[PDB]
């Protein structure tokens, strides 16, 4: 679960950064054969077999196709915590309380218009349950 969530988070980073690929793969086809063709070309060097097998699964637009990778990664990592459900949920509401009580910190956290590495460093330095912090870092 932890290995697969890292593979899905890292391929989501490749998908949001490779905009030319994103805007080309976000188009429906009459067969899977080209979809598997680029999947075999690009997924083989840096990703695990389970992650590739899941990614091998039609979406309406590129934003939704990218979001669906994060959604699977969140599910995976939360299933990994469940395999501590009360402690991850309570810590995650508590981080939501800290963010909504501090509107300058929540706005400074709006990092899509900024370098995401420096954002993740800043959040990990400001922020406890390890998996709740992992979801927040994801």
């Amino acid at each position: 679960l932890t290995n697969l969530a890292d593979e899905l988070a890292s391929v989501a980073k490749l998908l949001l950064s490779e905009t030319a690929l994103n805007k080309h793969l976000a188009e429906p086809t009459d067969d899977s054969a080209p979809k598997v063709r680029l999947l075999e070309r690009l997924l083989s060097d840096k990703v695990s077999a389970t992650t590739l097998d899941l990614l091998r699964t039609r979406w309406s637009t590129e934003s939704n196709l990218i979001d669906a990778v994060e959604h699977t990664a969140r599910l995976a990592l939360l299933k990994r915590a469940e395999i501590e459900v009360d402690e991850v949920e309570e810590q995650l509401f508590r981080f939501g309380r800290v963010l909504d009580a501090e509107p300058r910190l929540s706005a400074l956290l709006s990092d899509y218009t900024t370098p995401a590495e420096g954002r993740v460093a800043l959040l990990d330095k400001a922020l406890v349950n390890q998996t709740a912090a992992a979801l927040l870092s994801q």
Binding site: E102, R104, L105, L108, G118, L122, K125, A126
Partner: protein, 34 residues
């Protein structure tokens, strides 16, 4: 407070670049101080 203020601390002339041009209009990206 403290950790956030330190992260804000850790965060010549201005250059923009032309991103569109035609018919005597040009759109420039950057120049946050113009």
């Amino acid at each position: 407070x403290x950790x956030x203020x330190x992260x804000x601390x850790x965060x010549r002339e201005e250059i923009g670049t032309v991103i569109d041009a035609g018919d005597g209009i040009a759109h420039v990206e950057g120049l946050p101080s113009v």
